[PDB]
Amino acid sequence: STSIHASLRHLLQLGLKRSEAAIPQTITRTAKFKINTAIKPGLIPLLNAQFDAVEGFRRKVLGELEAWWNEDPEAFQKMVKCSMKMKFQGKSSCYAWLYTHFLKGATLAQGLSRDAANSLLDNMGGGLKSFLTRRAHVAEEIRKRYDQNLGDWDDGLKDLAAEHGLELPPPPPRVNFEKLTAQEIEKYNDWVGRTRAWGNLLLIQKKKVERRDACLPRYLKGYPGFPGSQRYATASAMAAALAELEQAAREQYGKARARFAKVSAESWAQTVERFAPAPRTAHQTVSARLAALIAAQPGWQPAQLAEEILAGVLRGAEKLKTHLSKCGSHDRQAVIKLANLYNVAVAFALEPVRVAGDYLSFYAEETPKRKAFGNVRGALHQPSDDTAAIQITGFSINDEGSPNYNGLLVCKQSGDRLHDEWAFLFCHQPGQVFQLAAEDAKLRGKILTEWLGFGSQGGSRKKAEASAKKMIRRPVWMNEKTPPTILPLAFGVRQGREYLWHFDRNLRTKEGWVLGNGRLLRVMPPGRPHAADFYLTLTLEREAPPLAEVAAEKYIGIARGEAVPAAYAIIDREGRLLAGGKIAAFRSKERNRARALGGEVTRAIFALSAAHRAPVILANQMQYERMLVALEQKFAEAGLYALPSAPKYRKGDNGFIKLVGPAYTSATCSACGTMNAAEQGALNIARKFLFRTERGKQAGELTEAERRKMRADWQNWYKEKLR
DNA sequence: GTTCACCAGGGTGTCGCCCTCAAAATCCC
DNA sequence: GGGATTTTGA
RNA sequence: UUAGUAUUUUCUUUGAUUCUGUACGCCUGCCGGCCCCACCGGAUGUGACGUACUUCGCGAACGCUCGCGAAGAUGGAUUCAAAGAGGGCGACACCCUGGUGAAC
């Protein structure tokens, strides 16, 4: 065994006791199957049509809500967080008002299934709410930072500015933190940047504070972007980017005719100094070749040879030929060499202005080129996938078996229970219906089918009903002339025997898993709909076993180490260590050393816990916290540690995951505030749990922020704990 | 010969903050 | 007249 | 493979071992003459498009014969080993590419 499944198996077969404080839990889990478009490739056009029709609605409502957000942000905040008591326009929580305003008595785009729009607006409210409740905390924090700045800038920390010249930059803008906007935060962060750049520019007055601790008006950061703002941003293609870059470069080439011949006495000396000889870059190429060899013998009148060097830099017309003519914009090499040529054309074209030390006209002239080069370099990268999801709000069936929404899971089951189908019925065209009736039912307008559907009933989250959700396995009667789409599905045995045919939660033969909601996911490379992957994401729920009275006779202390990942030590209820031991660009950097190690140590932690039955003493780092989350999930899924709402409410003594903050000790026979490796560290972390048991303090709150009156306490305790 | 400030544009991750609808009541030809 | 739509919740 | 006597599928991944690793045409990129182009040339040994060949999935006639779509140095195959609960939106943290600035 020794495996996470086979160790959770032992943890379930752990007849400790049934704690009377056992609050019922629920285990939410998801089965992510793949529609088998390979077998049924005719879906791909249909599924993609539905998906791109629902993005049209998604963006329409999102943009409308953003326009209304900046127009009436107070009324918008009233709308989002409605309720049965505080209604907006006499409507309950967001979804009611969304349907009323957007999909009530409103025609839908051709090919859009108003069930898909209903689920869209159903799921919109939980994004608007997150936006609001993150903006609140942000606003508070950025108010703090603004307070700090305004209180130590232009008022309080002008002694340093008084020590030298440069009285004061422009004054900071006023930000109405009563109602702060993205625009106001933008124009304040702009001034923060201006003043930071001014401080770095005035580095001659001993203002080396870029990393030295002084001055530096901090930024206002963290303000959320209204939902959809950064999702469906227009972005930019390549051809447009290169066209705007070439327009800016040609502008500079044309206007550079005589800007050189304005002073050309010491300006040209600096021009030649900047672009002088050093895979040759565009800068290196032009500098080392064209000015170097066009100046000496030929082409006098520096103005005239400036035109010739710019003609050379702009001889990259052949690259424009390779792109526009035969071959496309998919050759990154040509695109990067053309963009570099344009950038250097501009950079050496504005050189006389740069030498003049304007930096204000120069910035204005290089803004078009700057933006164009940014949009070329940003369009050059595309390792991303466009993901759109359609959600079935639920899988419920009325008294007659007719569903309330547009999705169902079906099984064309065989006699031997070895050749079952497990497809998904989706309803999106007009006339697509199905019923969960009996084989002996006589339904009008519907024809039986070999499919067996898994509906649900109950769980209505209303005081009146407040039932317990229960599935319903009943044969599927489909419309003869208009059958709902069948999404062949594709999974593994390890995956279906977890959710579909589980020894104890077999969908068709045993009570267990409960249907939650669903999502049809499209995951396609941008602009490549025929390569789109499709998934069905079914959320199932369980009731976890009740907690157990952990009268542990042994404990498993576990601590991190260098020679060891997470060395472990098995003690009893009175310490006196019983046993000890050791546990355990993109590939090696992240995967090999994050996942393959965290997972192995986690299953080793379960192996130790279950084998010795002993609860885990674990400290209060991303791969440590992922191991902690996995242990929490798979102990809560055992009649053990009770998962807390949000990871803030860690009880510190919560079943088998008994959390103790520091160790801050040693085993030199006199403690601290050498022997073997972190094995003794885990010994002392377990003993420290035992000590804090007598002490009776909340180790979770102020795990390390407090040191006074604590460091000496454990120091003395271990200095005396030798009897 | 890199390291900081600011500016333009992307990419990769993790973290906030939210969610995992059933059941009527009402127009339909 | 079942299919589609609408409102609703602590 | 990663279930307990014992369950079906083909999913998304992650380690470790051994094998298999496509042709031409033209453009393009690197270098020299040359100084950007253009013509010359080297290696082309970095992109790209066009056409072929290998494999795969769906269809049409008799293991062959044809029509579409996918991939072909981040590929494919073997033998072990093992996770997975998903979605949404947005922010941060870091990195790459360019530019200006002075400081060292």
Helix H segments across A163-275?
A: 182-201, 238-255, 267-274
Residue A580 and residue A704 in one domain: yes
**Of A355, A379, A403, which residue is a domain's last?**
A379
Radius of gyration for chain A, computed over Cα atoms and rounded to the nearest angstrom: 34
CA distances from A273 to A259, A267, A269, A352 (A): 18, 10, 6, 12
> Are both A482 and A570 inside the same structural domain?
no
Angle between helices A114-152 and A182-201 (to 10 degrees): 40
Distance CA A541, CA A26 (A): 7
Amino acid A142 CA to nucleotide D99 C1' distance, rounded Å: 30
| Coil, strand or helix at A388 | strand
Domain count within chain A: 3
Distances (CA, A) of A266 to A252, A303, A356, A569, A659: 21, 14, 10, 76, 71
Six-digit token string for A392? 């079935």
Q: Are residues A399 and A432 in the same domain?
A: yes
Residues A364 and A104: their CA atoms lie apart, in Å, by: 49
A103 touches strand C (CB under 7 A): yes
Q: Are A418 and A428 within 8 A, CB to CB? A: no
Q: For A582 and D64, how far is CA from C1' in angstroms? A: 62
Residue A502 Cβ < 7 Å to strand D: yes
Within 7 Å: CB of A109 and strand C?
Answer: no
SS3 at position A400: coil
Measure, in angstroms, how far nucleotide D43 C1' is from residue A414 CA: 65
Residues 133-152 in A having a C-beta less than 7 A from any atom of strand B are 133-134, 137
Q: What single-letter amino acid sits at A347?
A: A
Residue A381 approaches strand B within 7 Å at CB: yes
Query: Is residue A660 situated within a structural domain?
Result: yes
* Residue A211 domain-assigned (yes or no): no
Give distance CA A529 / C1' D12 (Å). Answer: 20
My answer on whether A449 and A537 are in the same domain is yes
- Flag whether A362 is in a domain: yes
Q: Is residue A554 part of a domain?
A: yes
Contacts (Cβ under 8 Å, ≥6 apart) of A648: none
The answer to the question of residue A86 being in a domain is no
Q: Between the CA of A279 and the C1' of D44, what is the distance in angstroms? A: 15
CA distance A125 to A93: 8
Give the whole-angstrom CA distance, residue A436 versus residue A452: 8
- What six digits make up the tokens of A330? 């998919």
Judge contact between A390 and A524, C-beta under 8 A: no
Residue A386: both structure tokens together: 């466009």
Residue A171, in any domain of the structure: no
Give SS3 for A138: helix
Phi, psi of A343 (to 5 degrees): -60, -45
Method in brief: cryo-EM
Chain B: nucleotides below 7 Å from protein CB are 4-24
d(CA A302, CA A290): 13
Residue at A323: amino acid letter: H
- Helix, strand or coil for residue A149? helix
Is residue A688 within 8 A of residue A660, CB to CB? The reply is yes
Q: Residue A719, Cα to own-chain centre: how many angstroms? A: 48
- DSSP state, residue A529: G
β-partners of residue A403 are A397
Query: What does the alpha-carbon distance between residue A434 and residue A448 come to, in Å, rounded to a whole number?
Result: 10
Angle A689-A691-A697 from CA coordinates, rounded to 5°: 80
Round to whole Å and give the CA distance between A319 and A336: 10
The set of strand C positions with any atom below 7 Å of a protein CB reads 2-10
Pair A319, A459 in one domain: no
A650 vs A51, A641, A658, A710, CA distance in Å? 41, 10, 9, 21
Same domain, A375 and A394: no
- Asked if the structure places residue A88 within a domain, the reply is no
Cβ of residue A620 near strand B, that is under 7 Å? no
What is the C-alpha separation between A172 and A581, in angstroms, rounded? 60
Pick from A150, A145, A121, A122: which is nearest to A60 by CA? Answer: A121
A655 dihedral zone (left: phi>0; alpha: psi -120 to 50; beta): left
Q: What is the Cα–Cα distance from A589 to A584, expressed in whole angstroms?
A: 19
Identify the H or E element spanning A342: helix A332-349
Question: Count of residues for chain A?
Answer: 723
Task: Match 């010249």 to its residue by tokens.
Answer: A165
- The whole-angstrom separation of Cα A533 and Cα A521 is 8
Q: Tell me, yes or no, whether A430 and A521 share the same domain.
A: yes
Query: Do residue A556 and residue A689 come from a single domain?
Result: yes
Strand D contact at CB of residue A321, distance < 7 A = yes
- Give me the resolution in angstroms, 1 decimal: 2.9
* Domain match, A282 and A429 both: no
Using the structure, give the distance in angstroms from the CA atom of A3 to the C1' atom of B22, rounded to a whole number: 39
Q: Quickly count: other Cβ atoms within 10 Å of residue A219's Cβ.
A: 16
Residue A171: name the closest of A137, A193, A201, A195 by CA.
A195
Q: Name the residues in A532-561 having a C-beta closer than 7 Å to nucleic acid strand B.
A: 539, 541
For residue A315, give the 3-state DSSP assignment. Answer: coil
List the structure tokens of A66: 């953003």
Confirm whether any atom of chain C, the nucleic acid strand, is less than 7 Å from CB of A464. yes
Residues A36 and A9 in one domain: no
Domain closes at, from A327, A349, A379: A379
Task: Assess whether A489 and A564 both reside in one domain.
Answer: no
Task: Using the 3D structure, point to which of A379, A413, A434 is the last residue of a domain.
Answer: A379
Does the CB of A241 fall within 7 Å of any strand D atom? no
**D strand bases under 7 Å from protein CB:** 1-4, 6-12, 14-16, 26-32, 34-38, 46-49, 57-58, 69-71, 82-93, 96-103
By three-state DSSP, how is residue A462 classified?
coil
A79's tokens: 């709308």
List residues bridging with A435 in a β-sheet.
A477
* One domain, residues A519 and A579: no
Strands A434-436 and A514-524, how do they pair? unpaired
CB A426 within 8 A of CB A485: yes
Residues 174-203 of A with CB under 7 A from strand D: 200-201, 203
Residues forming a β-bridge with A377: none
CA distance A52 to A532: 12
Cβ count near A176 (within 10 Å): 8
Angle at A211 between CA A210 and CA A216, to 5 degrees: 50
The Å distance, CA of A337 to C1' of D42, is: 22
A481 touches strand B (CB under 7 A): no
Domain around A11: 4-17+548-720
Cα–Cα distance between A91 and A82 in angstroms, integer? 7
Rounded Cα–Cα distance for residues A436 and A410 (Å):
10
- Report if residue A207 sits inside a domain: no
Contact A490, A33 (CB under 8 A): yes
Handedness of CA A367, A368, A371, A372 (dihedral sign): negative
